[PDB]
Design a protein around this nucleic acid. Sequence first.
RNA 1: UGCAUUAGCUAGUUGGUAAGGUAACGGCUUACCAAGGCAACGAUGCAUAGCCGACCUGAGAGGGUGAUCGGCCACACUGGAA
RNA 2: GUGAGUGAUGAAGGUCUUCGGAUCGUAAAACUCUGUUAUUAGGGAGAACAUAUGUGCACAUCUUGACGUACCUAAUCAGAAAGCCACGGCUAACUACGUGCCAGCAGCCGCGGUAAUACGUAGGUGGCAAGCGUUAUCCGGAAUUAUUGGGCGUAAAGCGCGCGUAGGCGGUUUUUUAAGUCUGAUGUGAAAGCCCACGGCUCAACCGUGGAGGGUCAUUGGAAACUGGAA
Lengths: 130, 80, 198, 83, 156, 136
Amino acid sequence: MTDPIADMLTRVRNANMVRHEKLELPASNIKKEIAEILKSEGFIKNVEYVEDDKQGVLRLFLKYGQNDERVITGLKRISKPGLRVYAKASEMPKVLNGLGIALVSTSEGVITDKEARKRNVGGEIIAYVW
Amino acid sequence: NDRKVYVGKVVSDKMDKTITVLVETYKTHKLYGKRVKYSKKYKTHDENNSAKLGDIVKIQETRPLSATKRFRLVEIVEES
Amino acid sequence: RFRGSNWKKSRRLGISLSGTGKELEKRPYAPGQHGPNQRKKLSEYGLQLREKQKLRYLYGMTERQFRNTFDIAGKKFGVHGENFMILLASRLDAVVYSLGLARTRRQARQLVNHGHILVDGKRVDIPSYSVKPGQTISVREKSQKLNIIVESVEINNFVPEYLNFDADSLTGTFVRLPERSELPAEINEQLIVEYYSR
Amino acid sequence: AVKIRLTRLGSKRNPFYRIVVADARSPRDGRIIEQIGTYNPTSANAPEIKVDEALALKWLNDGAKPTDTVHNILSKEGIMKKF
Amino acid sequence: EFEERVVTINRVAKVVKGGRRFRFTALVVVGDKNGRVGFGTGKAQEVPEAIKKAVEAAKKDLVVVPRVEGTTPHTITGRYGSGSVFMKPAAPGTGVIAGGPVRAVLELAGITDILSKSLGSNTPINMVRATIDGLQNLKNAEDVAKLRGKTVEELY
Amino acid sequence: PTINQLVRKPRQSKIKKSDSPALNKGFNSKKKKFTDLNSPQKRGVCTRVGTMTPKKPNSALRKYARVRLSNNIEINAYIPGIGHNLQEHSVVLVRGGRVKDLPGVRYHIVRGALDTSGVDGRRQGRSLYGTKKPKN
RNA sequence: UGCAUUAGCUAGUUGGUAAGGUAACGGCUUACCAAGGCAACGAUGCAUAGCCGACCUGAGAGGGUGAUCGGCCACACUGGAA
RNA sequence: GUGAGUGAUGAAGGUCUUCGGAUCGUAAAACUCUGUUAUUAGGGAGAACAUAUGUGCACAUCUUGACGUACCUAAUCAGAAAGCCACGGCUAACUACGUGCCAGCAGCCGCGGUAAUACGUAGGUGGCAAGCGUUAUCCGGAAUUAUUGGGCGUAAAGCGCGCGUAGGCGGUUUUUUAAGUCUGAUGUGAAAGCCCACGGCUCAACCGUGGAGGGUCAUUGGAAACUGGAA
Ligand SMILES: [Mg+2]
Ligand SMILES: [Mg+2]
Ligand SMILES: [Mg+2]
Ligand SMILES: [Mg+2]
Ligand SMILES: [Mg+2]
Ligand SMILES: [Mg+2]
Ligand SMILES: [Mg+2]
């Protein structure tokens, strides 16, 4: 395995075409905030968290729309092993006219572009989801 | 107004104060944004302070007093 | 000047556009030598050449100025296709064909050369100005009347809005840059808003 | 050696002037130490006196010289006998 | 009522035992100016009514374009086949900036303010389908809040 | 390619094959060296005229020359004109742009150029291939 | 800035102690002592080019220029030394 | 600005003509209209500052023009705003005559082997403007060098396949660090120029004023989620 969270977060799309509601993950400490800022912003019905031994289980329980429209409709990893990016707090980009919500590891943990203006901090912006 | 304060390892040493100081540093490339690392081989002089294979110690630039060495400090912390 | 026949390019385009009409007393079919035939189609090149060229013969300025008045129109605030229509009226020759001096711009756009060409001070012997809000284009002091300007001042009346002149001085410091409503109506702004932009 | 600039700026056929701490051997548009104001030499200006001389107070208080017959603009100021 | 603009025609042949025989194809696009756009393709041995043969084929299916007030909501790149378009919103007074075919599906639509550029190929049968695909992928700014469960204010 | 093999051997733009290759260069008299100039036109004197026929879709037969320029870079340049000139040992002024379908000419001859002012029996060409006597 | 179809360069060359000498330290010069120092993070070699705030283009990233007008070098028939 | 309000198909004469009539064309006269150019005029903007005497180097008061065209005013002429290039499509611009794979056009596809709207003229039309067009160099169009922003089955493109050092990247957790990272207090990136605001040049070209705004930096404050660094 080469990237600890790209292999995670691209099981979401492959578990978003064929319309599951299950996905099991190798959990971490990082992802137990990642899948909750997607629980804070509606994109997941219910993640519980890792509840087993030897850094084991993690399940997600996704969310689909009313007439079986997929809700998470777009997904992107941008800051990568092999090429980091680091966006300062002045030129922080919005995602799809601000509809989608990026996410950033900064001096106060992982926050988003909702929180990139009250803190006026910057960090490694790693994803874009829409 | 102060001297330089660069720190870093060595390669080896020979007779008469050949305290060469390897320094490693990061830079971006100017276009592609990759974090490329590179070194620089420096020089300073002392009595018998260092030896081969690991003599990381700060140096400080001064008046030249050599043909290539332009640092006057061998203030030692880490070694073998 | 144009040094040509403006009643021979009043049917080669669609309009005399400087009076009421000079095409009903002629063959209004086509320009010449192919008038006894049909009419073709029109592309977007037909849009640019028909509209820019149908507006150039209404303010008689030659080209290399059209771009200069185009970004001179552009270097401002608002909608561009409205603002070229806002700076279409600041020319004193336009106020010398629109404040009832003479009809055709060959004589009416010659109103700098011999007449009441003073404008709140010295004379302005050119074909325009940057005549902003609050400035009077008065009469000449040694002659407040030429031949044609006072002899045909009583020939027409009921002039345009956003201008309020008087008699016996031929002077106006009236309002401002005019409205986008009162303008030359027969043009399409967006068919020429990208024609000199592409 | 330090002097005060009177250089030929502006549109041609309209010789203007800018007032700055100059040197006797560097030319008109040459190397400039520091600015010392300007003056409208246009002879068509009512308000013209542009010398905020608190940033030019160090010149004549550390070894300046008068400049090349600009002395009547040195007349409209008064900075001498203060020391 | 409804406006119907021809984008292009083409003279299309077929070889049989004798000389080859011709027929004209003519795709047309039908716009309704409130943001509902269809398109169709005509195939007959004449110009001036194979147009109508396509126009009756165009109204049978439409797409509901998301008008934001004089514009499009966000940035999208609808591609279909090798051709592609680059769509981008702009200020309310801008005009429309597009190529040949991809303004015949925008001014015949009701958007009037887009910066755009074609990419990839340039044959007019692949431009329009990728543009319509791009307009289907666009979403309103309120139904995202509906499936999200947020309000409109909570996103900003 | 990935970034490490892209900061190692970087990008490298395409070559620029240039039109009019037999130009832009002045071979010096004293120092006897090629140079670079990027010059619009050059002089030259003529050697042959001739006319080769075939232009396989075009099929007429037209003339040519072998001028050689300042400091002897010999060339084949095409003469525009229904008529011609009557001069060996000319003082031409050549011009770029390839008259196609003749394999081996990329160059013109400007009519006039202080050797022959073109053809006299042409009126409404009036700058191409050397006419005069217009007062339009 | 371009060449790996240029891969081994350097011998007061790289250090030490002196002796001098220069406005000033110093392998700057000589007396010995020794072994170094540089390099696939492109040394050396050939070829071309005076640099820069700027100018032209470009939506932006970038690409191409260097006479005007200013900053700083280097040079005055060619070479040396006061 | 080399002309102006008029001015009945308006013309003698060019072209189309099957000619009956459109076209140049309200073009033109010949009336009526004008000083820009031409003979004279006062023609006098930058144009300042001291080797002195009265007061105690500072104040007021007497000392300096090469271009002498300019601004000016005032009679008032018609002195050439002409010529370039095209007209099949890209890209607005159409008819006749000699010519017949010839002589010849050509950015590109291509036009002429007898009726060429692509040759050479004629007339008309289109774009221009005191020029037009051509050859030459750079950028975009070109995402045809693709970090934003391309690909490698058959289209150009996978080493014949191992074992491997230099270099590149790395699972899970807890601690400390602070090189990369994020942030703010300074010193600095001169002025002339570009970007908008303002004064002046009969407006314009052009000038002066205060700001973006001068990049990787410099030193300490500061935050410690991720990449290093060590247990
Ligand atoms: Mg020179
Ligand atoms: Mg043309
Ligand atoms: Mg021809
Ligand atoms: Mg490709
Ligand atoms: Mg292996
Ligand atoms: Mg290894
Ligand atoms: Mg400060």
